[PDB]
Amino acid sequence: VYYPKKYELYKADEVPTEVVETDILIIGGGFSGCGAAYEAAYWAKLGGLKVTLVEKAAVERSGAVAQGLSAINTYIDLTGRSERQNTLEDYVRYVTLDMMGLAREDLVADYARHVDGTVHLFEKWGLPIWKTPDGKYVREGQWQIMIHGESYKPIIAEAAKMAVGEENIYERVFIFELLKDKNDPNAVAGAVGFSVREPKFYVFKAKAVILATGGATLLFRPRSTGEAAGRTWYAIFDTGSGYYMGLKAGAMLTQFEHRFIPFRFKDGYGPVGAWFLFFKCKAKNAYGEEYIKTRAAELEKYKPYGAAQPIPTPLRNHQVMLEIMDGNQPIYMHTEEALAELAGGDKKKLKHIYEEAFEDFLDMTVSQALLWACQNIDPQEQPSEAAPAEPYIMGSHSGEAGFWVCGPEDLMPEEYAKLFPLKYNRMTTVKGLFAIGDCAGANPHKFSSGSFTEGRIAAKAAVRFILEQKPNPEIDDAVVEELKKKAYAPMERFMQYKDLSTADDVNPEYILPWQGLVRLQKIMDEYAAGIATIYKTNEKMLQRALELLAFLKEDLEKLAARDLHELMRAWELVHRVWTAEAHVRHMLFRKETRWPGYYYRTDYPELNDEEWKCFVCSKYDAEKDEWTFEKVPYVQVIEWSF
Amino acid sequence: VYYPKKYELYKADEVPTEVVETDILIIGGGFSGCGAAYEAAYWAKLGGLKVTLVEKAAVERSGAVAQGLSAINTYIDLTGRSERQNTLEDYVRYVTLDMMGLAREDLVADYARHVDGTVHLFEKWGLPIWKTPDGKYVREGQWQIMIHGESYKPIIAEAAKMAVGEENIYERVFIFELLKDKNDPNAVAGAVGFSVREPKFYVFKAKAVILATGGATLLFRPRSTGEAAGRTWYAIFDTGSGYYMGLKAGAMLTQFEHRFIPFRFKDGYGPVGAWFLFFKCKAKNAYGEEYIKTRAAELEKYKPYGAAQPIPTPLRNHQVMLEIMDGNQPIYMHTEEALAELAGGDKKKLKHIYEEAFEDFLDMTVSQALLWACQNIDPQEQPSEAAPAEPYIMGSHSGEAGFWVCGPEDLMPEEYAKLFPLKYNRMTTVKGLFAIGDCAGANPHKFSSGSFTEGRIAAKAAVRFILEQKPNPEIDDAVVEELKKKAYAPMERFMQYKDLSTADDVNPEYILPWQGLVRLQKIMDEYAAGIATIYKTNEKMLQRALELLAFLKEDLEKLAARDLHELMRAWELVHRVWTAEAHVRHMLFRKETRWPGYYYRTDYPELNDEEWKCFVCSKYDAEKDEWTFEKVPYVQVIEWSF
Amino acid sequence: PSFVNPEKCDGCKALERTACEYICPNDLMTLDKEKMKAYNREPDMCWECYSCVKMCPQGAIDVRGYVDYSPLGGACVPMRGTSDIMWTVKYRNGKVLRFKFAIRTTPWGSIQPFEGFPEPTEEALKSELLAGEPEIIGTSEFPQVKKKA
Amino acid sequence: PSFVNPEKCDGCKALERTACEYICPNDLMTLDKEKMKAYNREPDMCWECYSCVKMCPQGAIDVRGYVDYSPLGGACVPMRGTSDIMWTVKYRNGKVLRFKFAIRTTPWGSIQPFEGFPEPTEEALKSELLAGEPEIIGTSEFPQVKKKA
């Protein structure tokens, strides 16, 4: 709910337009966007190209890493700088198995061969990495290293700023739609946005556009619906903007049915990675049963996924869901037993790991430490409850939802190159349009380091694209004007109909952003495998979801906004609604349950490797208002065996 | 969420006190309260007794019947005034079987032998009852008769006003606590309240007090958490006030674990009674299966309850829950097939039944008709989705939670009279304190007619009690002043700590009523068999609930209020929290699952007639802050067989 | 939830009481002394009972379905009289339905609570009989119920 | 969510920009021009990331746990420096914990983005190598990955 202190209303015709011409436009200044700005600045010099970074908030703390992070979740270690070295083939196998067999290995192997360099730069720039007495990076699990990352984002922001230049960074500018080439329906030409600090409409003209908006949250109703609706596990700041603008432009999405359900500390959603992998914490149900063991049998049916080590995350979730369905909650993270066993009676050792435990929270999810403080929970004395949150859509973490993007020339097979008019690394099916981080699908487990890395890869590819193809798209002024009118339409609608009611938020002719969002969350929660049905859905429910989303999309044309802040909220809602629609259509298309633990199709409860071991790709045609789906069979690109 | 336009603050010592002396005080002017006011006025003349009715809102439309009702759910018909005559023995059997074997038959048989007279008076007073051409009351099901009841409450309000006199009715006065006899720790002496229209503290001194506050809603998180949190199926106006003040006074509760889960039209919660019983509508899952058929065998384990006719409502809910857990939603009420079948090709007949169908909604739950309008649902063309709402606690409807009350001397067995110091009909274990309607437990299915009737019963008993025992309660002025300070404490706390933050609703030293309510709803939903777990719970979850309720209860001492409206909201929250605790403790005590469909104890999944065919009664001792539970074995009072 | 139409609301002219504020069962309707116009002060606590709508003499109150599940466009408008009530239901798609139901068979304010009842007596006070019984029940005598043998 | 202490907040009137308004990732912190003091304009959209808390030069901002699940009394207070950050965790029961963690090993604003890197060339632009590679990866040669036969 939002109650503005006062009005801040503008009509489109009274808002001045500021045109910005650039060669490479990066939308979003988070981890992937900063990686793109950094790398682009290096290669751009070859053609005196201009690089522009636009961020809706402030790069210093914007995005998922606002609080910092307690570990870098992707560090291969090909030389032995950490406690555990790994190989690239082992990593690719690991990601494919976690995805229950479906991952673009050309894209995964690609960011993986580059990621360690990024991490090394991060340390060189000042990021303090946990080290052993021998000077080795401290491992959390097999692929992550612990960091003192409270300032992780500010450090990366500084690197990007020094690289591209402050004059090329536009903050507090919300991008709501892309612009396409007037003379080419499948080529990008720029983007439009508006300031949230003053009345100013932005028209960005670019040869290449890189989507780095982060994923999408608040599509589903959370387990807390009051103030705590703000406590989404994933970044509340990311509302599926990239997904919306890219899909509207005609860029194909892939694996959009692949949501991520995070099992974390209850309510605050503090991390469990360190507790599980580093502190060797055990998770048990209300009756002290360690379900990863008692529910081991249930995973045998999944071959070979059920016998993989580590067990794929969705299957780990599935064991948890079975306990929940049986009503064996609360589920506990036995931190008290973990700390006692690790300390081994050494009080000084206890104090040390105790401090490490609190840093794991204070460096990234302070709310959990605050929750413990408010509830008088001392981790060395009593266990904490854990629970799976509502669904989130993103492609950089354990979820792989995002745009279907091109891979590197040396790794991408012909099988995966078919839909790309131009074969540039990380370019979408729309020429000149790239997608990175959460926006790039089918190549998950990138996390902070991998996202920054993917941004670097797309950036170099964008420079190469511009110098080789010498793109020169032309925006359509008529469309720009129509979009400028749309941009501020919510404010004009408020002014036009507010007099129908003595209450600004109870009007028969418009819905405010928070009102449309509550509605979206309810629809998704009840019909799209949300928490309401313990992540279960079926064809009928999904079809009803589309019907209800249709009503909501029509009502978006009647959105109202009272100030710039709410105008942004209005478009963030628009972005989520279309993201939600794509998610529903993707879940509806795939007739199987490949990721039990993330979602279950009760009408197709089994995993089908006979006809569904394929990526599901879709395209939305705005002119025809039609969605088309196709199956792209998975092919093993990298050498590995189970 | 509440955002007051302006402050309305008062300090306890600035508020004038109004002392009201009466003989019989009725708290709550809904259906049971009006029934008590009506009857009390008749017998009071014997001693020139003063009868006082206090209502927080306005009697004309206050309570569950604010929109009216489409039927009178309890009309035995012992002469043949309706399409179907019934016997009292059959009715008592029906209610006991619906309660899965647990009902105070002395109390049920008692209101049943009186209810028809009340209905006949209602018609006399102007209520239009549906009639057949032959002049017979139109039956809905076996026990209900259809009515044109839009003005059902106003008509009843007039009867009560005419009987007791407007000078004896206090409106817009919220009662928050009872007063006990200074001369006797287990005797009532009156009650205290405050006006919500002006700064005025009320002290009601009485010889007899009758609790008629209605049940309790919004204890659990609803299926809609935005504006629609207001669309509770049961009366949102009833917040467990009677339960709170009565239990605090030491009056024993019974069957407080027995919540009611209403299966109604989804979201709007329109009625299904007429559709099922009158229109012969079928409910089918997403695949077209009529689950009362496919799930019939699953009730075989509940012999002989599963063989009853009609089938016990909780068991009907159980069948629904099984469908929901299997993922067979949406569940549809096939109104289109019902209307077509009933009309039989007769277009004029269709028009007639179509008007009847809409009246069924417009006469009691307009929101459902509005929902259809907004969603373009025409019942003659397409079916509607149905679903079970969150739990509600009341004793007049299908739920039997309430106070343990005394029955008539001619029906109550010695087995049930043991806990009453004085044997007066509907008196609680606290001398002089009576409970009626939703406030009287163990005798459900009273509904509108039965609640009014129960009020009449208690009112006559109250007059008898006064004239026979001749009580002369003395209020403790010291306690009264303590309560006066507590009454406005929230306003004084707001003024005292608001300066700690630039935002009135984000303060570290206090919570606002809506904030505490969101918290209560989350706790009950997640741990007390709410919708979150498909109504499942266990010992551990319930125990954790008590822990979280303990924190909340302590925080109630830090409640803040910005105006009189919010001050009432603060106390309504206080009332709900204690009601919630009692409910949790009751569910924790009963180690069995007797009402699957309403709630499931996953740790004690079976119905236990060997050890739990008893009423669970409890008493809260405010001085020692201790809860004591007792099991009162059920005894069959009325003659009947399965 | 309910909402007041500014153009029709007159803050209840010179009458003795504000209708909407007076009738609301949840104390939601109140006056903005500045505008002299009413408003719902806490819409998420509105049961959509339509009491305020029915009692507004200017017909300045309507209901806009809860945003959680209500697409825009639907409306239910009552015109409550003395013996009946008329309803107009307008669908989002333009469809319009009209109904009319009875609400009372006698004049308002005509109830005589104990009409025809004998006076109460101390002896009667000790029986199970309520006012008007057993006559009002319609049976030949006070209803008897068989006790379990 | 975050909340501002009126006593400590000076509206950043002695600074070129409002710190909290500038830093908030969700655009929640803004100034009440009347009081010239900040406030969280939409608390239910607060991620409790503590960015505003850490960047307020007056230490006027604190966080009060979401009411949905937070009993009153708890607090986490940071004191962020240049090379480390200190935290004080205060429990509802009064217990107080103190921690101190490093946050940066180099001076702020000292990053030289391409330090040591050779100049980009058109020939290099066509390879799979990113700036500083392959050496920044720790290997003399670009990492190879076995393709499946």
Ligand SMILES: Cc1cc2nc3c(=O)[nH]c(=O)nc-3n(C[C@H](O)[C@H](O)[C@H](O)COP(=O)(O)OP(=O)(O)OC[C@H]3O[C@@H](n4cnc5c(N)ncnc54)[C@H](O)[C@@H]3O)c2cc1C
């Ligand atoms: C609670 C949590 C725990 C995690 N734990 C770990 C961990 O321990 N280690 C690890 O390595 N990784 C972890 N990650 C993952 C990591 O943070 C991501 O993988 C990474 O930040 C994704 O980068 P991004 O660029 O895709 O999104 P972000 O970094 O979120 O950036 C997106 C940017 O786009 C902006 N933006 C959005 N919409 C618009 C618009 N319309 N116009 C302009 N700008 C816009 C945002 O404001 C933000 O600046 C975690 C994330 C969260 C939220």
Ligand SMILES: Cc1cc2nc3c(=O)[nH]c(=O)nc-3n(C[C@H](O)[C@H](O)[C@H](O)COP(=O)(O)OP(=O)(O)OC[C@H]3O[C@@H](n4cnc5c(N)ncnc54)[C@H](O)[C@@H]3O)c2cc1C
């Ligand atoms: C959606 C719905 C459908 C139903 N359908 C049917 C049907 O079709 N037919 C039928 O016969 N019955 C039906 N009933 C049941 C019927 O309405 C009840 O059984 C009856 O109203 C219960 O009477 P009550 O006196 O216990 O509660 P109510 O009538 O609710 O009255 C309680 C009173 O107490 C007041 N109050 C509460 N707290 C305080 C306080 N602290 N101080 C002062 N006053 C207070 C309330 O404002 C109200 O005036 C239905 C109820 C609902 C909500």
Ligand code: SF4
């Ligand atoms: S009853 Fe109608 S005219 Fe009177 S104040 Fe309310 S809305 Fe305005």
Ligand code: SF4
């Ligand atoms: S519809 Fe009913 S609950 Fe809502 S404001 Fe009007 S009278 Fe009050």
Ligand code: SF4
């Ligand atoms: S940064 Fe601190 S001092 Fe400055 S405006 Fe915000 S709260 Fe006030």
Ligand code: SF4
């Ligand atoms: S804690 Fe974070 S999201 Fe909340 S107001 Fe402060 S900076 Fe914004």
